[PDB]
Every structure is written in structure tokens, then in C-alpha cells.
Amino acid sequence: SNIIKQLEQEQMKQDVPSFRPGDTVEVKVWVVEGSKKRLQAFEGVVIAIRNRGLHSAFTVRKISNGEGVERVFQTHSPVVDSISVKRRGAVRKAKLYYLRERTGKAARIKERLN
């Protein structure tokens, strides 16, 4: 247990910033491609969220070229590289699956602002 955790934190990164279930965020991951290897963006919007120490995910909704896509980022993985924060908003919810079936205008979310 405490042999673990010390094993966990031993790999936990402190780069990951503030996170709220509703923000836009922009994750950058090493594509690895073929001969090459860069960093691929993924501007999205949070819909579900991790919170399990070394073990954690993002679960983001995009709706890219044509239809929607979802991506649960194992955060603490090198592939994560760097994750932005972009637009933050108001949700009044923990998980936003009620966004699956929505489409523009109806999928619209509010802005946080204190």
C-alpha cells in the first residue's frame, strides 16, 4: 500500500494544471507517426473525469471532421506530453454524457466566470 503510492507518485507528473468537467482543453500527444514523430493537438471539451492518482483519464468530446469522437487520456502517460486548458465553462454536473446526443446550439455549454 504505502510501498505502492510511493510507487504511484513516483511517476505522477505535476505539469497537469486545473481541471473541470466542462472546460475545452487542448491535449498535445506524440503522434509517433512512421519515420517522424511530432505532437498532435486535440482541442475538445471535458465530459467525464479521472481522479485516481497515477491512474487518471480525460474523456474528451471533439466532433471533428464530420462526426464526433471521444478520447479518454491516461493523463500521466508520456504520450500526454502537454495538455492546455483553453475555454472553461459552466456545467453543474460531474459527467456530461447528456452531451452525446446534442449537436450544435443544443450542445452549447455556458461560461464559468467568477
Next chain:
Amino acid sequence: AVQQNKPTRSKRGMRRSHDALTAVTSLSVDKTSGEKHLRHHITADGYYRGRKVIAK
């Protein structure tokens, strides 16, 4: 689904062998009172591990 042959008395007791019983295996005695009681739980009238938990 019934029997085909009336079971002998022998085979009966043979089954009741385990269907026996067990005694009290000796019981406890209280410190405060000379209560002859059942281990881990209250004497004839309020006493236990000494004390007097619950009068009367």
C-alpha cells in the same frame, strides 16, 4: 422419485450417527459472583467479567 427398497433400520441409524448432539463443553464461573454461567455472556443475574453490568 421414491425409494425402490424399504431401507433397513441399520442404514437408518447409520445416517443418524452424525445426527448426534453435544453438551455444554464445560461452562464459565464469574469472579465477583460465584455464578455458574455461559462463557462470553452474562451470568444468572447482571454479573459478567466481574462488574455488575445490568442490575437485578
Next chain:
Amino acid sequence: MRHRKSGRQLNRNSSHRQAMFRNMAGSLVRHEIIKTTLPKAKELRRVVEPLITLAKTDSVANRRLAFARTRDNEIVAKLFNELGPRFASRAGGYTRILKCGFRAGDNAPMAYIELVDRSE
């Protein structure tokens, strides 16, 4: 398989184990002592203990939320205004359980859940 599960389901709903308990709960306060099934006792304890721990802090929240559990102000008063500070120092074990078991009807095991400082 029950592996690592908690809370005896007894023999009824999830509505019973939230009434026949909530009741016995106040019945504990209202009388300081009680005779019941060791199993039931070894449960009401998990009920009437987190309530006293809540008795520590007077407050308005700790009153209504203490009313949320048990519908007897008469006891939510004995709590906060008695057993509250009565155990204000108590580390947690606010109750002895005792035993005796064996009832007339059912060969059922009975106990004697009771407040520690029950010396009257």
C-alpha cells in the same frame, strides 16, 4: 459472493433496514439500554454511534441532518444536549454490547446494546 462487502441485509428490503433501525436507534437513546438480536445489535451500533459522533458539534446543520435520521426531536435533543458532550471526550466506542442469547420462542441469540457511561 459477498467478498469484502459490508452491512447485514437481515431479512427484508432496504426500506426496512432504514426504519426498523432508525426506530431501534431512538429506542436506544430513549432508554440507554436494549435487548435484541446480537446480529441486530452488532448493527444498530453502526447506526447509533455515527449519530453521537455527530452529537459533538451542536450547530443547526448537526440537528436537521440529525433529524434527517430519526424523526424524534425528543432524541435529537437527548443527542446534542446530553450524550453529545456526555461523550465529548469519548474516543468513539460509545457502546457496550453484552450478550445472553437464547430466546423463548426462537433459539435466537439476544444481546444488550447499551451506552458506556450508563451508570445512571
Next chain:
Amino acid sequence: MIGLVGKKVGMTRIFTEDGVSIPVTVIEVEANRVTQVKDLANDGYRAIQVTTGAKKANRVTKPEAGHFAKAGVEAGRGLWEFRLAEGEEFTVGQSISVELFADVKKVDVTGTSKGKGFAGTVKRWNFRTQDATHGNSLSHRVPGSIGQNQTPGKVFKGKKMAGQMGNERVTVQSLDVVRVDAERNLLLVKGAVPGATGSDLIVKPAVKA
């Protein structure tokens, strides 16, 4: 070679430079004090007994002390044989450790089990379930026919059907080592070995390459 007696408390990740996320099981080997090494001198053996934990000493039976004292006694949960071929070891508390492994990459691990209990087919034997409708009667998920007819006149031995499930040896084999970091006495393998956390389990280098 031989192995050491560890303990379960694993199940974790370990990201790689590239990007891979390796699963894991954290076996803890708290040294292995040889209890009564012995050669052909007594029995066709050639193994070496051990120990690892620490009984409260107040619990250890008197018998569970003599054999101990008749060597580098150091309490411990239990005792475990460890057959070897062409090798030495001092019958006196030698306490071998995870250093054992390093160049080692095989490993096997052999905890107790999982212990379900009931079992019953469909799970105890992956038995298929006969339609929960279109008729049926008290026979949805049941054995259904455990034999044939008069010719056989009986039910063959080994007939898969119900009966206690789990709670027994079950090894694993293979599993690449990730960390042999002592000082904490940790041994990180690929992933999932019987056990059930805290449960004792051997860890000998895979018989298979």
C-alpha cells in the same frame, strides 16, 4: 535455479520513455532465511527450506521454534521447500533475496487462488445457457443431461458439473520482470498472478524459456 517466497500487493502501471503503459503485480520478497537445507544425506532430496515473514513469536508453537532454532531462526509466516540441482547453500540462516533475479527474466509465480465457492456450471465450466424463454421450465441455466442411456448405464468420471470453484495452487508461467529493486524488496512482473493481495506466493524462474 530456485525461487523466493513473496507476498501480493500489486496491480499498477509504469509508463515507458516511448509511451507504453506496463501493467504490474508487486510481489514483496522479505529475504528467505534457509531453515534446514539438506542433501541426499537424508532422502533423495537436494532442496532448501526457507521462511520470510515474522510470526508474533507468541503464536509460534514450541515445535515451531525448535526446527527454527536448529538454524538461523527468524520466525516468519511459514516454511517452503525449494528443490535445486547442482548447487550449495548453508543450512544456517542464509537469507537469499531478490538479487536472485536481475539477469533473470522468466518467473512464474504461484499464489493460492481466488476462491469462488458455489461454482456451478456456466462459470465452473463455461457451460452454455439454454434459452431463457421459448418454453423452458426450471431449466434455463442448468447442467441438462449429465449422461446418455442404458448402454453406459452410468455417469462417467470427470463429468464437468458444479462443485467448489477456486482456492487452489494455479501457477501462471512466463511474465517478464520489470523491477527487482531491493531495499524495499520489490519484484514487478508483467501482470496478474493468482493471489488476492497479502496472500503468499512463490516466484520461481519460468520452466519455459
Next chain:
Amino acid sequence: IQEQTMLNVADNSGARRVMCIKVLGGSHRRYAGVGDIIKITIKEAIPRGKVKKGDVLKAVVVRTKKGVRRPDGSVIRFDGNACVLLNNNSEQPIGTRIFGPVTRELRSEKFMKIISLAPEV
């Protein structure tokens, strides 16, 4: 992904609804996904095109609803099941533009013709 099932055309010539009729790969292969070859049967199809309703070609899954994942253990899922037609007897897509995103699990050379095609990943 298993017999029956309805996938979408991720390219062109024979629109929407297209039913899978056989999971290729081996005896009893349960379901397919990511980027495997699957026997398909056109169900709707556009009036024109080179392929029409009733046809029985084969196709490659491009966007399952379940998703994919590996390395980090991060899952990429979509909402719907994508497909892609290819001239039956000897590979490569019977089309021009491939609509929508894909996955790098398709960068397996022998499919390339598709990944080069513009939407994403």
C-alpha cells in the same frame, strides 16, 4: 463487427446502411473492428455510383462505436460504425474521397491508400 450490424460508408458510391454478413479471419471469429476485412452487403446506395444496392463486396472497419486503444491505455471511441468498400478479389478501396477521420492502426501500409486521404489521424 459481428454478422448483421449496420455500418456507414466512409468513402463513396453506395451510401449509408450497409450490412455485414461475415467476419473474416477464421472459424468462429466473433466480432471485428479497428481495421479488418469484412464481407459486406449494400443496403441503400446512392442512385448513381459504381456500386449499387444488393451488391456483396467486402470492406474495412474504420470507426467503431466501442473504440480502440493501446500504449498508455487511452481509448479512442467514435459514435457510430464506419466502413469502406474495396474491390473484392484483390484489395484497395473502390473509391476516391474517404470521408471522416481514421486511426493510425490503419497505417499498416497495405491500407495506406486510405490514410493518405485527408480528414484526420
Next chain:
RNA sequence: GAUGUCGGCUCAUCACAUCCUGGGGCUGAAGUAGGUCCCAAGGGUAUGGCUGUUCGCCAUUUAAAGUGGUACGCGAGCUGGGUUUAGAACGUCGUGAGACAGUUCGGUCCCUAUCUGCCGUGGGCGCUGGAGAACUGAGGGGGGCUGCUCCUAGUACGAGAGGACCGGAGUGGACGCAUCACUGGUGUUCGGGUUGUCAUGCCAAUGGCACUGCCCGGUAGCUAAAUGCGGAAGAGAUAAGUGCUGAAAGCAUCUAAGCACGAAACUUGCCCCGAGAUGAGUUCUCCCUGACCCUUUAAGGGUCCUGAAGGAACGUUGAAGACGACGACGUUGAUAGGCCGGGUGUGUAAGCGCAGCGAUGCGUUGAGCUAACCGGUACUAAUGAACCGUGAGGCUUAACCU
């Protein structure tokens, strides 16, 4: 004085006249692949359309979709679609009642298992002093499948087209075992939202009932679609077959003497049960070293004093469990619950203030609340005892002693 029919389902077991994979002889065998025969039962051996169908035809797969026995395997295991009750109609036959090896629509499938047998699990006694452990391993079971791609080598072969052997690497299909770290499911014991209504005097805040009233999310645990691993290499003895040397039989000859190779079959290797292995095994450690009496007396019976090692019970309990069992702990304490702190999960409580006529919004406040989880903590419960087990262990002979 009743042995339930077909087809299906579930679950099988065997045979080999072998469908696939394995080893060979011949070929009208270049290769690639085929044909045929011999050897071979380890393992493996399709989903759908139609039909009650088995079967079959068709579609699309596969390494292949074997053949046959088992009351044409299996209804005190499921179905009841076909098939012989009673209704009704058609065609047809008969004057008619009715009938059809014609058809059509409808039409009650019982039994709580004593014995055998099985899958599990205990209680006795026994293994010759009593105990606590660790193993030997006679035996028993499990497992045994295979596609494709890259290399060799675009080489041998081939006029081309096409295209290997032998050996090597990797990745899958199906099957199995294990595990919740990941991705998810559930999660009526966590949180929130909400409709109707009854109630706690009323406001506010709450609770009960309505499938958990409806619903969104979710801890632990359980789990698969999730994750890791596995069926091998390698030995030995062979099958068909191939041979060496060689006589019978001046030659020839796999054989007669005598030697050599040779398969997923066989014995092993791999995993699990395993000394009731009554042939009841072995190793290590531990505990007991008082009197007396009565005999039918060398076989013993009883009393007084002792009661050990260890066990059993009892209690707190467990990722162990139907009950037994097995594991941990018992104040020499973390063994349960409570408690403290943390995490996780919901999602910003109540009270108060501000703004708004109001619904409501904002601040306080990522607040309030939170289990089965993690770390820690004797507050409560795990009592001193009492119970069982005894007190140096039969003979015979042999090896060392004396």
C-alpha cells in the same frame, strides 16, 4: 398390471472405414499444387436463408466444416415445431355414419431422489507413545488445435506463368486459466435532480409512500467486451516407410545374425490432486521420566497424585465459505465495529447577506454529504480459567554398545 415417437436444445462418450493438421510408398510426381494407397484418434472440425425436418439446395466463411456406435446417446434435463384423441373445413371415397400413409386452422409435456452413479465437501477410525510442521512421489487427472505475414528466396524448379523445400521471426482465429492495474458493466448500503401526495404547528429545511416513484452519476466488491499467460521446444521407445552389412540361395537381399534413422499417436517434459501408497512412506522439532492395590498374574483390571506438547471449544472476524471446513487475532491486542485523518464519488449544503416584484440568481463555498477503500487509533468487544490429551512407548531377530 405402460420400455414416452421425430427434429431441435443442453451436455456428452467411444470406434476408425481420418475431413484438417502430422509421418510415409507410387504417380500419367518440374515446381505450385493434386490423384491414390499405407501409418496415424493428440487435438481440432461454420454462421445464416427456406423447411418441423434430420437431409438437402442456396449465400458467405474455414486449416477443415469427417464417418459411424452410445434405447436411430440425452423429455424422473428443456422444447412440443413434425407425429395418432376430442373442434372445424377443403379435395376425394361412401346412399350414410364416417374415412384418407392427403391437406388445412386450433389443441394441458407430472414426480420434493431411497439405492447405483457422478461433481463438490465433512465427520469417524486407522496408520502401534502423543503431538506441530516440511516433503518424497506410487499413482490420477489436466493440457495437446491452427491461419496469415516477413526472412531464407523471388533462390531451387520453370520456355513462362508461376513458384517451394529445410530452417527462422512475428502477429492473429478459436479454446483455457488467472486478475481488476487499465476500458467498461453493475453497484435498491454514496451523492444529486425531479412529479404526485401525506406528514414533522407554519416559513425554510426534511422524512414516508408511489417498481429504488421516475432519473443522472458512482466507492468497494463481483465481472467481460478488459488485461497477462498458456498449450512448445527437448529427450526416450516406436508406426508405416527408408536404410547399412550380410548368409540362407557363388548373385541378389532392410533380416535370418547384427546395426541406423523415423509422426501431433506411446513413455516423459509442462500444470494440478496426490501415503486410506492398509505396501498407510520419509525429514525436522516438541511434550510426558509418582505412587499404590487386586488378580484367573507375565494378560492384565482398578484407586490416589498428576494432567503435558498440542488440540478442541468459546469469542472478534476473513478477498475462506451452503453447513462443516480452512485462514487471521484474542488485552503478550489492529481481530471486527466505532473513531481520526486521507482518498474516491457526487457537485458548490444549511444558515446569513446582496440583487430581482417574482421564478430565481450571486457571495460565503469546488461547499455539504460520502461504503465495502488507504494510513493510523485500544474507544467497545475479543476473561483468568474450565474441557480433551497423559506420565518415557509390544515382541522377535540382526547391526553397531557394555
Next chain:
RNA sequence: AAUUCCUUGUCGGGUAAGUUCCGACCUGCACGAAUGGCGUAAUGAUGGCCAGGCUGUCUCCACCCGAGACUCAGUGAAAUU
């Protein structure tokens, strides 16, 4: 065809694939005009077939909540033999 034996007749439609179904042909084994012939809107817990929606019917079962089953105390059967 509630009538057709041959029979899954033949052709067309529907399907990836259709001994059923719908439309035709006519060679009616053995339709046919009040033991009525051919139609027919509406109606039908009527027979057959198809599609959307829907789903644990199924691939392929997992978890959960309850009543039994299991343990304890009281009472206390049955067929059959």
C-alpha cells in the same frame, strides 16, 4: 388454391441466400355456380408474409434487489416399498 399427387412445378418480385409469402401460367392427380361461383369497404385476442421502432430473444452472459434453497429452534407430511 384451406382443393395440386408429381412438388421446393415453371417464370417474375422480395433476400447476400426464400420447400413460406406476393404476382402470373394452366398440365384443375381430384375448382365451379345457394351441401353456392367470383368479388368486396368495414370489422377480427382469426391463418400466412414483410418493414420501421424496440429490445438480454440471441452473440454471450455480467452485476444487483427480493421469495425459497443452506444453518438453528418448534411442529411435522407424501408416493413407493
Next chain:
RNA sequence: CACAGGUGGUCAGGUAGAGAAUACCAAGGCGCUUGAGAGAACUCGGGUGAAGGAACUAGGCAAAAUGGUGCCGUAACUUC
């Protein structure tokens, strides 16, 4: 049988509602004459299910789903 069955007439409160539906309640009457534990397979009655969606099967059997009021708008055919 102190049996989940059968038995004709009368009375008819509050909130919600079209209502002698239904949900919750008044007055009033009851908790059904074995209980206590456990939290096994399997059976019965339910709730939730990733991806697929009739591939089930003799047959969509059973489930799942639809479901109210106002308005819009509504085909073949017809005995209008």
C-alpha cells in the same frame, strides 16, 4: 382446512385527475398464527446492462417499446 377461489344490495370524505382510473391520504380497519440467521449453486419475481439489434426461434414466444391534451397534417380504397 382459520383454503390466494365464489357471494347480491346500500354508503362514497381530502389533493392531484376527464373519472367509481390511479397515486397518496381522512374516518375506520389491518401487518395476513412459525421465527432467528446466512447472503452458496439452482428455481421463482424483479432492476440495470458495453458493442451488435431477431443473428433467437417452429414462430419476435417472452421481453422492449407506444402511451396524455390542444393544434398542425394525414394514403390505397369505399357501401361515402
Next chain:
RNA sequence: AGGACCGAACCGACUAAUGUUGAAAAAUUAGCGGAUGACUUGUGGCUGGGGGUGAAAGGCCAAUCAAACCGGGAGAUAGCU
């Protein structure tokens, strides 16, 4: 207006499961049809066994029906067990 429409009471029984030594010698549960009419129900009356009654199933006529129940002919007869 209507053997009209949706739907409780009320009348009925199309499907399924559970029950099958039942809670029950035909029911319970979830559904299902009818619901101003050839509707439904209380009380009492009349039809009698080769007879009744029957919107017709050999259906009903007291858990009994191709000829009720009871008593009698009756110790029918039984080349059968």
C-alpha cells in the same frame, strides 16, 4: 341515433410464466375482448333420462353424460385374468 368508438364497475376468457403431492379437483400474476346490449345480475317458477335443454360442442342436466343419481332384478353373464 347506434347489436357505434376509448375505458372503470360488471360479463368474459386470447397469450405467457408460476403452479401440477397446488393457496386452488382449473387458480394467481402480467397482459387480452366486451362494456346501452343477441348486455349483465338477485329472488322465485317450469322442462326429467332414450327424456329434457342446446346461436350445435354429444355441449349441459349437482366436481358424474354417446344416455344422470339411488334402490331393485343381482350372486346378470365372464369359453377371460
